Amino acid sequence: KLSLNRQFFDERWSKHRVVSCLDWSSQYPELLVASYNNNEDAPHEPDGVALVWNMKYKKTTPEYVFHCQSAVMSATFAKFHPNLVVGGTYSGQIVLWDNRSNKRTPVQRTPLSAAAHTHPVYCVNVVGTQNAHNLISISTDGKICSWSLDMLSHPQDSMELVHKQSKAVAVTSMSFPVGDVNNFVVGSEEGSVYTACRHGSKAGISEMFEGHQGPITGIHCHAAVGAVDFSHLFVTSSFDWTVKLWSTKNNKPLYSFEDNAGYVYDVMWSPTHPALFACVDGMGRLDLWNLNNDTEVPTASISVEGNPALNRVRWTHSGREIAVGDSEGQIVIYDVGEQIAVPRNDEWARFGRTLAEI
Amino acid sequence: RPHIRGAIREYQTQLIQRVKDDIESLHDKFKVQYPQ
């Protein structure tokens, strides 16, 4: 069972565009961000036009319109900035929009210097809390750059990302684990997914684990079972149609869950109910599932209207619903409803450990 | 020290609006000219 709620779409700004990454309100509740892509059929329009919506207000208009010059390859909210919107681009500059200024252009654009990114940033993110935060931009070039949300003309802390060999690490949708232990996992271009540190001389790339050959599209981490498990588990996504569960100590671990007749594009599993991961396809199917109940099948899955290549999906934080980003500019909103967080749900840990023994 | 420097933005903005208003008063009073 999947509770298909309302949808968000506006032809005024989703006119034959590609829905890029998403994010829910990391500060507010259920008011999400939608990064888009350029539509070369409309060259007069801005390339990257981000948009937001408000599920808690129950309306249809894209509440805010924001648009830099280039195509926004990534976007999300800002940590403890209830007026700001951070953003990655295709060119390499990192933008910064504001809502209260009513300026449909970002007010603080990262330069295009070598010290900054001159390659698209697929994953730019805030990290800790009030005093524990920063802004880490990681372009596909292979550089990380810490930035304050105040100073943006120069990266606060910045270094590259290379393996033991001096070859580049074409990152794609990295993710910090729970707690910001600075050991963020990095979805590389294809295979060689890495764990990478930030503080110490050992910062950067820790080790390579390869369990799939198709080019990576996403990664995610999660939290506690209700203070039962460590939950450092992180699942990935790739173009080989398979999704592998990983560990911080394995190299070719846990069963690579494969969805056939579909090009996997993203995974993100809500820490609420320790295992409820949702993958997507290049056909219009949301085949999400829990590993405790099922084993290798989508639990309460659904397909999507028409055949949209579902680009990105995000669980509604601290609760349950699903944001859906397609290859076509349209946002769909589903919900589990009946797939409530099971209490004392350690069945999954016993399950994954029993599978891990073979 | 960034450790220290993180938790003061609220107070900073309070002081900025103070600075703001006073420089605005300077725009006002200097916009009136010396002969008058």
Chain A environment of B16 (Cβ under 8 Å):
none
Q: CA angle, corner A172, sides to A166 and A173, nearest 5? A: 130
Residue written as tokens 């999660």? Answer: A222
Nearest CA in chain A to B8: A131
3-state class (DSSP) for residue A38:
coil
> CB of A131 within 8 Å of any CB in chain B?
yes
Q: Which residues pair with A237 in a beta bridge?
A: A218
For residue A328, what are its two tokens?
A: 């076509």
How far apart are the CA of A26 and the nearest CA of chain B, in angstroms?
Answer: 20
Chain A environment of B1 (Cβ under 8 Å):
none
Q: Which amino acid is at A96?
A: L
**Residues A114, A93 contacting (CB under 8 angstroms):** no
**Residues A52, A63 contacting (CB under 8 angstroms):** yes
Chain A environment of B6 (Cβ under 8 Å):
130-133
How far apart are the CA of B6 and the nearest CA of chain A, in angstroms?
Answer: 5
**Residues A85, A73 contacting (CB under 8 angstroms):** no
Alpha carbons A319 and A290: distance in angstroms, whole number: 16
What domain range includes position A235? 1-358
Q: Which residues contact A124 (CB under 8 A, 6 or more apart)?
A: A74, A76, A86, A87, A88, A94, A135, A136, A137, A138
Q: Which of A257, A253, A258, A252 is nearest to A356 (CA)?
A: A253
Domain count, chain A: 1
Q: Which amino acid is at A297?
A: V
The helix, strand and coil proportions of chain B, stated in percent and rounded to the nearest 5, come to 85, 0, 15
Nearest CA in chain B to A134: B6
**Residues A287, A301 contacting (CB under 8 angstroms):** yes
3-state class (DSSP) for residue A348:
helix
Nearest CA in chain A to B7: A131
Chain B environment of A132 (Cβ under 8 Å):
6
**Residues A299, A288 contacting (CB under 8 angstroms):** yes
**Residues A19, A325 contacting (CB under 8 angstroms):** yes
3-state class (DSSP) for residue A269:
strand
Q: Name the H helices within A78-155.
A: none
User: What contacts 24+ positions apart, CB below 8 Å, involve A201-205?
Assistant: A203/A159, A204/A144, A204/A159, A204/A160, A204/A161, A204/A162, A205/A161, A205/A162, A205/A163, A205/A164, A205/A169
Residue written as tokens 């369990």? Answer: A211
Q: Are residues B3 and A130, on separate chains, in Cβ contact within 8 Å?
A: no
How far apart are the CA of A2 and the nearest CA of chain B, in angstroms?
Answer: 43
Alpha carbons A66 and A36: distance in angstroms, whole number: 10
Q: Number of helices and strands (H, E) in chain A?
A: 1, 27
Alpha carbons A19 and A8: distance in angstroms, whole number: 12
> CB of A130 within 8 Å of any CB in chain B?
yes
What is the C-alpha radius of gyration for chain A, rounded to an integer number of angstroms? 19
Chain B environment of A130 (Cβ under 8 Å):
6-7
Burial class (CB in 10 A: 0-12, 13-18, 19+), A160: middle
Q: Which of A173, A184, A87, A187 is nearest to A127 (CA)?
A: A184
Alpha carbons A11 and A17: distance in angstroms, whole number: 10
**Residues A285, A262 contacting (CB under 8 angstroms):** yes
Q: Which residues pair with A135 in a beta bridge?
A: A126, A147
**Residues A159, A144 contacting (CB under 8 angstroms):** yes
Best of A130, A131, A157 to disrupt the B interface by mutation (most B CBs within 10 Å)? A131
Between the alpha carbon of residue A1 and those of residues A317, A333, A337, B2, the distances in Å are 20, 14, 8, 49
Q: Which residues contact A33 (CB under 8 A, 6 or more apart)?
A: A22, A23, A24, A25, A50, A51, A52, A75, A76, A77, A85
Please give the span between the terminal C-alpha atoms of chain B, in angstroms, as a whole number.
49
- CB count within 10 Å of CB A225 equals 22
Chain A environment of B3 (Cβ under 8 Å):
131
Q: Report the relative pairing of strands A33-34 and A22-23 from DSSP bridges.
A: antiparallel
CB pairs under 8 A between A and B: 7
For residue A33, what are its two tokens?
A: 């961000």
> CB of A166 within 8 Å of any CB in chain B?
no
Alpha carbons A83 and A249: distance in angstroms, whole number: 40
Q: Which of A121, A29, A31 is nearest to A331 (CA)?
A: A31
Nearest CA in chain B to A129: B6
Q: Which residues contact A18 (CB under 8 A, 6 or more apart)?
A: A36, A37, A311, A326, A327, A328, A329
Nearest CA in chain A to B4: A131
Alpha carbons A225 and A209: distance in angstroms, whole number: 26
Residue written as tokens 């069972």? Answer: A1
Resolution of this structure in Å: 3.4
Helix (H) or strand (E) holding A354: helix A347-356
- CB count within 10 Å of CB A5 equals 14
Nearest CA in chain B to A81: B9
Q: Number of helices and strands (H, E) in chain B?
A: 2, 0
Q: Which amino acid is at A189?
A: E
Best of B4, B9, B10 to disrupt the A interface by mutation (most A CBs within 10 Å)? B9
How far apart are the CA of A130 and the nearest CA of chain B, in angstroms?
Answer: 7
